[PDB]
User: Fold this.
Amino acid sequence: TLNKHISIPKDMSSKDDLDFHFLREEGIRYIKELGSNFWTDYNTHDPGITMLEVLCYAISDLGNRINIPIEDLIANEEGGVKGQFYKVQEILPSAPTSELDLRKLFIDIEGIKNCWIKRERVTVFADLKNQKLSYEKTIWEDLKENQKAQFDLKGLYRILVETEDADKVLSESLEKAVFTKFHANRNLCEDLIKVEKVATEPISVCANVEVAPEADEELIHAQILIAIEDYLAPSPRHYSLKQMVDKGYTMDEIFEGPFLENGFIDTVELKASELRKEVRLSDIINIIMSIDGVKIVKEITLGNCDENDGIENNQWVICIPENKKPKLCKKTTINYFKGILPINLNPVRVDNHKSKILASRLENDLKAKDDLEPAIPQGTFADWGEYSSIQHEFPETYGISDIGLPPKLGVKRAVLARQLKGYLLFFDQILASYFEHLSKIKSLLSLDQGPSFTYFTQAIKDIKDVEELFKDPTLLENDEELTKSLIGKLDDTIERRNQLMDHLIARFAENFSSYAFLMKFLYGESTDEIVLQDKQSFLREYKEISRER
Amino acid sequence: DDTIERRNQLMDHLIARFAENFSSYAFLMKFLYGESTDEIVLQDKQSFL
Amino acid sequence: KSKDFLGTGWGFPPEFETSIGQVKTTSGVEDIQKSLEILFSTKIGERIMQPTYGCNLDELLFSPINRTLKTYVIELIKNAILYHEPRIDPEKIDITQGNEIEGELLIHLQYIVRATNSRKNMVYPFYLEEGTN
Assistant:
């Protein structure tokens, strides 16, 4: 990001419209092929050749502006790309319709750490003797064994919530938040029955652990304790955009689901943090042995936390009921030793270490809330269609410049100068059109509203007598009238406007071909106007149309 | 200048040059003294040399 | 931003501000004028690894004023500039005595700032490809 030394290339040869000498040679070749019977003098004093060189110069100027980068050619006066493009924040995200999307949707409600989505099985019983159905099995009284049926319902939900509060119930403000978001964003033919706090199962861990003679025991205890808790019940964290990029994800993936205001959530972590079904010693031991300073676990055991915890099996693996989250029972303990001597720990020191370790996690979740979007390159704005008359490129001798021609040379020479100005306007009106056409690219491809014309022109006003050269000066006061008068019918607007619209629609993989005939059952000749209006409306409304399906 | 940690590192190096080792003072002294062990232990290491 | 090869740097008698924690800098023509003040304020052997930097004008103190002296003064000034200030061309050196009694010699140097970049001018984005000698 340092400044570099600047220089200019020395091989000025391209054989295209930016190469003056190339253009000049082609000009002369064409002249010989077409008019050598009458025009043979190609020396530099010749007015013919002089005009050719002026035109070649003008062509290079046009080519040079065509090469201006897009960022500037379609820039708005106020900056931005509002009518040109839809941004990634707007066009890539999708409404949430999957199980993972719902978990991401609700996990952003402040106070909620995790959520699980389960399905309700409402049962309906039926009498096949007398078609009748009820939620009661009383519907079967007095029927034979082959007159009975049951069906289960197919689209109902239950939401299990894990909160920060560690209370017995959910706050009613959370229930309102979950129900509100569910209903606001739901699938067709599905509904939510209940939102409730997740149930738990208590597990005991007891051990004798030997540590290094030069080790901080209060810190070791805080670290072991946190690691076991994370094993039993993991939770996801929020990331900044920069972090998602460092992880190796691309744009299509980062913005795949619902947009989240609090930072990005990694799908892998989300899938991993599912309710655990089994707990085992082979994992708990590894957690303890990996803590720096631990040398030997001399004794360790697991067990369902219960009363009358007398002599019982090792319980090398403990299974958990299908809708519960495991949690340490708080009757747990670790005895720490150095060599053969027991040591004692202080509660205040441990609490301080545990607090610091976990508080630093909150700091990152908060930082993740600011970096939520990529940069877009920004250009400038500068009337790309500005045009100057080629008449200013000739010498004073010709008499077609601003200072005029000296009176002593007589009227006839002044008249002849007028004749030349007339002739040269045939070349300027064409060049002016091409410059004018660049100024309209933004309109031609607009998502808000395109123009009614596809070809354009300009009044030329840097010529001192245009008010006399033109039969009706009125047109020079309004480029729209001038366009209708000079180009007129040559502009087949209906066909050209449809081609532009179809291209823009195709960019979103959509297709309006059927309007071509379906509208003829409603309208006659007037369909051409109606159909173009509908196509423009479709593009404007597209952001919502493709998302909220 | 974190003198307690740096002074211990220097002393341990010098002691090691004679193939000796004072690691056990790190915890045995805690059954006799509280926070004051850091000063006591450095004094004892110098006396030993 | 056309005249970027004259460069930007510290003011000679560096001044420190307190309204913002910065040292004042100079640029362009201002920078050139301070360079000249530095060069003619220092003696040849005063810089440490630059043993030939400065001037010898002190050799002429306590001497009478005549044509031979004036010729020698002009030579000293022109060589110091050719060796040490690449951005200018001297135009005129005017040497006169304004006091019959007081021991004063008055020297007026006029010069022109160069429009093209010298091969001895060490300004960062230029010398890398243009500083041949």
